[PDB]
Amino acid sequence: GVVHSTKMHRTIIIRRNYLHFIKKYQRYQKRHKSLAVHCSPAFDPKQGDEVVIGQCRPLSKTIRYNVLEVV
Amino acid sequence: AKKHLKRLYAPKDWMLSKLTGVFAPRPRPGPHKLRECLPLLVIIRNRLKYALNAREGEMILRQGLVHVDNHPRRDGKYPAGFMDVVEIPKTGDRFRLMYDVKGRFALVNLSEAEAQIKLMKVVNLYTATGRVPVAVTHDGHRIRYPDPHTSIGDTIVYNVKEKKCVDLIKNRQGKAVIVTGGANRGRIGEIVKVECHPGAFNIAHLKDASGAEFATRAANIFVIGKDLNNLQVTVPKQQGLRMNVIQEREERLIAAEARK
Amino acid sequence: GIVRSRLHKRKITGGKTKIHRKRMKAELGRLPANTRLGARRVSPVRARGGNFKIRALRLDTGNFAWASEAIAHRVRLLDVVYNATSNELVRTKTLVKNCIVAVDAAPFKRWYAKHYGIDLDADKDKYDVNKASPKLQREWTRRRRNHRVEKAIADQLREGRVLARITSRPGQSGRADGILLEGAELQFYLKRLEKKK
Amino acid sequence: MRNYNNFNRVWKAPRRPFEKERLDREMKLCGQYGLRCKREIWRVNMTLSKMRRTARLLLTLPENHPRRLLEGSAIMRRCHEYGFLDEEKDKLDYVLSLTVPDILERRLQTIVFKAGLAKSVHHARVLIQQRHIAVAKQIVTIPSFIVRVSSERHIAFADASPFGNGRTGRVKRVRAKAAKRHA
RNA sequence: GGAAGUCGGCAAAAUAGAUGCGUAAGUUCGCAAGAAGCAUUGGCUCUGAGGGCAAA
RNA sequence: GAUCUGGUUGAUUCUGCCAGUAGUCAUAUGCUUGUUUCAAGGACUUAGCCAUGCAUGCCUCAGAAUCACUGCAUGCAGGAAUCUGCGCAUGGCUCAUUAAAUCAGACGUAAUCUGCCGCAAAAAUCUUGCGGCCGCAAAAUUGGAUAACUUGGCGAAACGCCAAGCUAAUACAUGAACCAACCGGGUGUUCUCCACGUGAGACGCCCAGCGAAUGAAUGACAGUAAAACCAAUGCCUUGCAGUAACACCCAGCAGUGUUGACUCAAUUCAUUCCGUGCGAAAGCCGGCUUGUUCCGGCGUCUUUUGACGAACAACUGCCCUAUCAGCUGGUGAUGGCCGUGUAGUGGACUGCCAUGGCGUUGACGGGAGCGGGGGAUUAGGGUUCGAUUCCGGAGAGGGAGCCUGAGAAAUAGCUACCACUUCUACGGAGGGCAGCAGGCGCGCAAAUUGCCCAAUGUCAAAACAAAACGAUGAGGCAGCGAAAAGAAAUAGAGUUGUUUGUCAUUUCAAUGGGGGAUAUUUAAACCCAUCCAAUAUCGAGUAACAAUUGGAGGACAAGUCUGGUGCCAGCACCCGCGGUAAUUCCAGCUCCAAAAGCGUAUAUUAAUGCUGUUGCUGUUAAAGGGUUCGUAGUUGAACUGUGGGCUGUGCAGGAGGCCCUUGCAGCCCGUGAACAAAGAAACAAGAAACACGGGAGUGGGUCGCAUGUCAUGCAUGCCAGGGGGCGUCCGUGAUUUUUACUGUGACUAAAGAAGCGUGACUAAAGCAGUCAUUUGACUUGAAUUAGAAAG
RNA sequence: AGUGUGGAGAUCGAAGAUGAUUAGAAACCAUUGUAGUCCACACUGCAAACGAUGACACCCAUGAAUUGGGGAU
Ligand SMILES: [K+]
Ligand SMILES: [K+]
Ligand SMILES: [K+]
Ligand SMILES: [K+]
Ligand SMILES: [K+]
Ligand SMILES: [K+]
Ligand SMILES: [K+]
Ligand SMILES: [K+]
Ligand SMILES: [K+]
Ligand SMILES: [K+]
Ligand SMILES: [K+]
Ligand SMILES: [K+]
Ligand SMILES: [Mg+2]
Ligand SMILES: [Mg+2]
Ligand SMILES: [Mg+2]
Ligand SMILES: [Mg+2]
Ligand SMILES: [Mg+2]
Ligand SMILES: [Mg+2]
Ligand SMILES: [Mg+2]
Ligand SMILES: [Mg+2]
Ligand SMILES: [Mg+2]
Ligand SMILES: [Mg+2]
Ligand SMILES: [Mg+2]
Ligand SMILES: [Mg+2]
Ligand SMILES: [Mg+2]
Ligand SMILES: [Mg+2]
Ligand SMILES: [Mg+2]
Ligand SMILES: [Mg+2]
Ligand SMILES: [Mg+2]
Ligand SMILES: [Mg+2]
Ligand SMILES: [Mg+2]
Ligand SMILES: [Mg+2]
Ligand SMILES: [Mg+2]
Ligand SMILES: [Mg+2]
Ligand SMILES: [Mg+2]
Ligand SMILES: [Mg+2]
Ligand SMILES: [Mg+2]
Ligand SMILES: [Mg+2]
Ligand SMILES: [Mg+2]
Ligand SMILES: [Mg+2]
Ligand SMILES: [Mg+2]
Ligand SMILES: [Mg+2]
Ligand SMILES: [Mg+2]
Ligand SMILES: [Mg+2]
Ligand SMILES: [Mg+2]
Ligand SMILES: [Mg+2]
Ligand SMILES: [Mg+2]
Ligand SMILES: [Mg+2]
Ligand SMILES: [Mg+2]
Ligand SMILES: [Mg+2]
Ligand SMILES: [Mg+2]
Ligand SMILES: [Mg+2]
Ligand SMILES: [Mg+2]
Ligand SMILES: [Mg+2]
Ligand SMILES: [Mg+2]
Ligand SMILES: [Mg+2]
Ligand SMILES: [Mg+2]
Ligand SMILES: [Mg+2]
Ligand SMILES: [Mg+2]
Ligand SMILES: [Mg+2]
Ligand SMILES: [Mg+2]
Ligand SMILES: [Mg+2]
Ligand SMILES: [Mg+2]
Ligand SMILES: [Mg+2]
Ligand SMILES: [Mg+2]
Ligand SMILES: [Mg+2]
Ligand SMILES: [Mg+2]
Ligand SMILES: [Mg+2]
Ligand SMILES: [Mg+2]
Ligand code: NA
Ligand code: NA
Ligand code: NA
Ligand code: NA
């Protein structure tokens, strides 16, 4: 995903942009999802960066993924 | 917990008619998974035809006349499954529960000194208290002292009567396997290669005797011999060779006309 | 009763979740132990599966471990001195995990004398290092060669009270086990305690 | 409740209720083959509609397609067995040319009249419904019985029928009882 | 009991400080507004927060 | 079957709707109805209210009988009752709630709990009996209570109750030494020895089982070659080749757990466990050969992990609405820290911090809805339905709370309140049909207070049988049932007269409906099927055993018919008809259409290219915004380029040569560099350079003799090196490459939909059956498919 | 066109007035006349605001003209 916000302490918001197909019109539409991801202090990513995230146990109300690699 | 099993919800391989009853016998917990097993009552009533209904099946089973892996089992809901040896001493019946090419359960007749041998795929290896290595098999058996070369995915050929391991066949390329799950269940082939995807399902690419290449997940393969020529267990009539559907239909039609 | 589900919580959008089922026993919570310092009193709690938790209401002693010495002793809890959640827990002498306590230093002092032949209580029932076999004296020298004790713990042993951190959960197991504070962690908490006398 | 016995329809009404050409054609078919209602023609119409639909689907596919090979062989075998198409016509395109009279000629009511066991199609139907005709020694009482080519030579009077090897019929039996009682 | 008194609620009763929440029609958009309403308040023993100055 | 027709004008050509037309397991309703097969059936409205009855119990050779119970016999065998153990958290019903919920496919739990079932594990424990803590001895001959029952009974009653007196259990409690092992830790101011203390060996003492808690150490290595110095310690003999380790009783009694990854499995050390754990149930029954070790079948405590499950999490997806634009954050909103709680993760919760989190890619609010599998309709694309059989979820009048239990926030369990209710002797006591049947209401709208456990299953202490038959309205079978679906009667052949055909005659045969049975079916019946003699079995002529429902101007098949009525009555979906010659109303006749069915109403699909992605229209028919700027959004120019040579072959084409069709073989497959071995160039991270026997079924391909012999050393080598190539694991190394699409493959319950085979008499079906007719073949068959998207 | 505040107010002229016409005529015609019409500033954003024809881009046959800029004689 792409880093969308880094305003939280050790938590970042990423975006997953994708195209959804509509069968009737034989055409796509742009959709996106937002995921709260824990970010270890060993990475320091920025807005617009691309990150790889791995699924972990629930770490908060919304967090289910941990940052693994910053590209 | 769930105690019933609707006949529509029952596995299709049990071949129970949708019109004859609402329910099917729910397998109890035990050696094999509920979706991957054949109940003893189904074996004694629907397959062997020794019992006309469940009440006669109860008559046979409660007396301990049916042995599974050299042990009388009195429950019609006992979940018999793959590679199990079922013996009825009174009628002199001995067969192994295997899969044919079409994925259905098959009763492959066995001779003596063959019903004493059963293959078990190692699914887990752990350490028990006292630093005792324990191997867990596909049929729920726990082995207190397996061979030091034993690995997960390997198969242990195991003497049921004497309750001891006698040989081990490693899970490597070039070994003969039988598929126990998926669309390729019942096919017999040789391991060409195994693709490893850590954190996901490993994929085994196999090749049968005729040269057909197929694949499945590594959990569905079951090593049964060093290679296709020397198997360590008797296999069903069709020898795990999938046969073209058009050719099969033509051969059946010709055979039917030859009969009449 | 008390529940642990997310149904009553607001969605991230701020909308209200419309609940369409009754509360389940599988999501229940229990009232806190609020274990205090005092003579031992526990209450068993039958948990899911038939297992028992021990809800400690009062505790007075526990197994406290000297990590650098790889030893532990059953010692009496003397006071609660610091709690990172609030100082009200200190005021009420509540025993929870990670809180800082002061425990009797006598068993640790006595073990040091027996194991190393060094009596920390110099300059003023009690083990005497003089009554030792010559073999034990040689083992004392062997142990003493590769050994250096820190002055902070050594001073605390001399005064008879040594600070420790609770490592168990009294509300779940009914125990007040802990580990003696050492090194930087002790210096951190000593500064916290030094604040405001 | 909890009954899983399947059932389905075998006929469909025509789209336009009143067409002079269609009504006259169906009236001709009813008289020619001794049918009871238009539903018997419409049943044949739906059958042919199904066969032509799968034939069109198969012919869309390329020749070497396994589904076309297996399904195409099966339907041609079905047509040859039931006499819908001649043995010479061995192409899938000839299924498309099947007509309603082709199916109607294979009815046991039609075959019995054509074989010569009945004076007319109406005589044939009542003979079938009155347990007088057997196909391979099995009594058949359904006029819409589609006769296989291999079964054509085995059509004859039933052994249990008075016209075959059976006992006397109602008229003679009742008169025999009356003669005994009157005497 | 509660305006039945009386021309008439005259007279009297009633409301009451501070703090938090909350507040309708209408409106020249400023108000209406302390609209209306709800809640808290003592004593004691503690805890936290809000500063100055000087010193390498 | 990719289809249209009537109505705008005097006529025409359009736009456009209205009306016609067909289907619907789609409901109701009206008329009609002989036979048979297969089936929906109080969901819609009132998750409205309910009289009565039933719906969940379980005993074997194998827990407990002194019924003052029965049979026999002088103890034997049944055995009411009642303790004990298991179940009642499943089934059945319903669809009210419900949109980051539920659900579907696909994944996780290393974040957990898990009775019954499968395979396994088990060496802790100072007990008992005779004599005086001590001695002798060893098949452990353990202890208190409470039911049923007896007595007295209370109470109008209550699936309501006291008190006393007996006696059991596999109920409850207690408790087993020696036999009987291996291993380790701490010590004695104890002995026997060596040297003048990393000394050795004994004995003595305290601990050393499974599981649990805290702390400490393990849970590997895999990025370099040689020399000396000292201290101790191994060998060699009196200085380092050889040398797994280890101060004997064990000279190999783990130097080696697992994953993709673990603080996990497991082991060692220290301390702890106070009931909130741990019997060989101090248990039961058999067999013989009758056994201080006879041999089996059961039952049970604890530990462990497969299985059946439970609970949590969420990758993508799901109607209408902006006359709903902001939502969330006192009092949790988003995240962080230490805690608490949970079976476990978590703002799930306390305290303290930081301002975050969501929204025009439609948040928030509102409206309609349980979600799927699937149904209807059908060129294709679509539209629409899904209360309802199977799967998942939720509920038991409304709410909440809770005990028991492995599992319930259970409701034919409990507690309370609210709303309804029943009995009463007025003190009190009760009730929950959205289980089956059935009532009352509600409505357009939906059956019997039936029979049975024979089948299908569930529970259980339980095979069947024998004085001896478990329960089951789950389920099955019948009754009612024109929802719907399949098959099919109501007549067939003549003869005479009136090319034919109709009519008037007159004959012949056949057959069911129905009536019955030596019987068959069925748990018993009932339906089907079989038969009307097998010596011996009833029956069609107006075959009265009598077919209906809508129509006859047009759309739309069928009358210039006859009377009646006279803009009245009425018909008429639309156009219209009827005002004295009605093709239309009311009737007769005749005819048309479908037919055991046929009208009507409403909804929905096609008709409809009148919702248009495929595929609409916008000058004048409805419809380009008055103009321009402009953000989201949609869309967006070209280029890095597709190779030669040779041979054969083909009207290739414009003598020989050049270029092309196809196929075969070569290419460092541009140029350069070497004689494609090495190096150079192109490459290659699905590579390259390193380095690990704990890497490779013993270190992958390429019968006596040497170690040694206090060893089950009962072992090891019996080609070695050098150089090349291949597996396994780790490390180092880059001014490093994905996604859509497309081709294959994997994973993916049935029912349903396609589809193969199969004369259930055909068919709707079903997954069966077929053939010799035999003491059984076919090693019978039950093919294969498609199924949104996402992964 | 209309509104607000200041200007301006010749002409024309909603409202209104008068005179005709007419069965009636508080219409058309005639003589007048307020607000307006004009300007500054600020509002309003209702036109047959029309080509009743959205914007950008491509292709497209013929004759005579026309406006602006270039090239040639
Ligand atoms: K205003
Ligand atoms: K009990
Ligand atoms: K029901
Ligand atoms: K034990
Ligand atoms: K936490
Ligand atoms: K908090
Ligand atoms: K009912
Ligand atoms: K009529
Ligand atoms: K008339
Ligand atoms: K008429
Ligand atoms: K834009
Ligand atoms: K215009
Ligand atoms: Mg008052
Ligand atoms: Mg007054
Ligand atoms: Mg008054
Ligand atoms: Mg008065
Ligand atoms: Mg007055
Ligand atoms: Mg006053
Ligand atoms: Mg307001
Ligand atoms: Mg017009
Ligand atoms: Mg007209
Ligand atoms: Mg005219
Ligand atoms: Mg009949
Ligand atoms: Mg009948
Ligand atoms: Mg209802
Ligand atoms: Mg229902
Ligand atoms: Mg007994
Ligand atoms: Mg249920
Ligand atoms: Mg699923
Ligand atoms: Mg012992
Ligand atoms: Mg009394
Ligand atoms: Mg017990
Ligand atoms: Mg342990
Ligand atoms: Mg390891
Ligand atoms: Mg969830
Ligand atoms: Mg939060
Ligand atoms: Mg609803
Ligand atoms: Mg549904
Ligand atoms: Mg409803
Ligand atoms: Mg359900
Ligand atoms: Mg419930
Ligand atoms: Mg109700
Ligand atoms: Mg229940
Ligand atoms: Mg409840
Ligand atoms: Mg009930
Ligand atoms: Mg209640
Ligand atoms: Mg039922
Ligand atoms: Mg009905
Ligand atoms: Mg019995
Ligand atoms: Mg009936
Ligand atoms: Mg009739
Ligand atoms: Mg009959
Ligand atoms: Mg029946
Ligand atoms: Mg006509
Ligand atoms: Mg109509
Ligand atoms: Mg008409
Ligand atoms: Mg359309
Ligand atoms: Mg169309
Ligand atoms: Mg249109
Ligand atoms: Mg227009
Ligand atoms: Mg481009
Ligand atoms: Mg070159
Ligand atoms: Mg199916
Ligand atoms: Mg079908
Ligand atoms: Mg002024
Ligand atoms: Mg003028
Ligand atoms: Mg306008
Ligand atoms: Mg316009
Ligand atoms: Mg110009
Ligand atoms: Na995994
Ligand atoms: Na007959
Ligand atoms: Na464990
Ligand atoms: Na039963």
From Swiss-Prot, chain C:
Of the GO CC terms on this record, one is: cytosolic small ribosomal subunit
In terms of superkingdom, the source organism counts as: Eukaryota
Annotated organism of origin:
Leishmania major
CDD domains registered for this protein in UniProt: Ribosomal_S8e_like
Q: Which family does it belong to?
A: Belongs to the eukaryotic ribosomal protein eS8 family.
**What's the protein name?**
Small ribosomal subunit protein eS8
Q: Which PANTHER family match?
A: 40S RIBOSOMAL PROTEIN S8
Q: Name one GO biological process term.
A: translation
